[PDB]
Amino acid sequence: TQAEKTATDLPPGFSGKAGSANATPGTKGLDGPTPLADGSFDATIFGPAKELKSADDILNVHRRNAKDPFAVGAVDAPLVITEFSDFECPFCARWSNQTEPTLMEEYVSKGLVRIEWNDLPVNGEHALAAAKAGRAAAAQGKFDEFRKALFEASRNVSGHPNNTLKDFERFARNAGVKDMERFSREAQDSTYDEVLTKAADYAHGLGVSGTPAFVVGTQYISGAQPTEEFIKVIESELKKSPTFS
Ligand SMILES: [Cl-]
Numbered sequence: 001t002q003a004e005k006t007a008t009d010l011p012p013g014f015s016g017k018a019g020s021a022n023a024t025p026g027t028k029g030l031d032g033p034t035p036l037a038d039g040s041f042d043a044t045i046f047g048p049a050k051e052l053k054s055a056d057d058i059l060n061v062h063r064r065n066a067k068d069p070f071a072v073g074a075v076d077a078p079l080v081i082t083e084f085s086d087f088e089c090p091f092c093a094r095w096s097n098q099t100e101p102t103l104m105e106e107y108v109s110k111g112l113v114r115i116e117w118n119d120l121p122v123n124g125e126h127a128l129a130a131a132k133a134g135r136a137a138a139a140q141g142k143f144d145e146f147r148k149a150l151f152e153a154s155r156n157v158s159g160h161p162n163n164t165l166k167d168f169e170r171f172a173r174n175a176g177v178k179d180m181e182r183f184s185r186e187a188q189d190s191t192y193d194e195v196l197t198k199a200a201d202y203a204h205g206l207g208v209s210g211t212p213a214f215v216v217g218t219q220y221i222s223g224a225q226p227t228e229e230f231i232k233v234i235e236s237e238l239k240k241s242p243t244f245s
Contacts, residue, residue: 026074
């Protein structure tokens with residue numbers, strides 16, 4: 001009785017960060033995307049790592065492409081979150097503003113989670129124009145900063161902000177986009193039209209129809225569910241698969 005034993009294992013509802021605690025952090029690609037030869041980034045990246053043919057192929061949604069300027073976190077993180085999102089969507093804004101920072105702090109910054117953005121424009125012309133602007137920011141390595149500036153500007157909006165070019169230019173300046181002539185041209189011209197069509201067709205082929213939508217490891221989540229739900233799923237998925245080889 002004059003001894004201390006190690007903590008008992010508890011049911012997961014009382015176990016706190018057990019998946020995290022036992023997972024192997026990634027060590028590669030923590031410093032951002034790999035640039036192209038000219039120091040710009042491949043803003044035409046979209047899609048899965050490999051075709052999905054059945055439910056058995058669910059992990060294929062996660063690209064783990066070191067060149068991807070739409071991704072944050074270790075390319076060898078044990079868990080990937082694949083997100084399908086729309087820049088006019090208030091549920092997408094709420095996830096970005098209220099859930100993502102917690103996931104950055106608890107998981108991404110520790111090498112445990114990589115988050116990959118995928119365009120799924122549902123809100124019409126403003127959403128397509130915003131996605132084109134996002135790809136123009138990503139070409140200059142500023143996707144994350146652009147996304148945060150735009151969604152923080154939507155933090156009090158219950159509907160759609162109806163952003164247009166001058167809004168996107170402000171978010172790009174806020175984000176530190178260095179070549180504003182290239183940004184403004186690519187935000188408007190045909191550069192990203194093909195890839196946005198292909199991204200939408202890819203999401204529709206998975207049956208993903210509503211934003212935001214997520215594949216957290218092997219688990220699909222529809223909508224801006226509570227932060228605690230994302231944490232529980234992350235912990236569960238890290239328990240199932242603690243290491244990426
Ligand atoms: Cl596919």
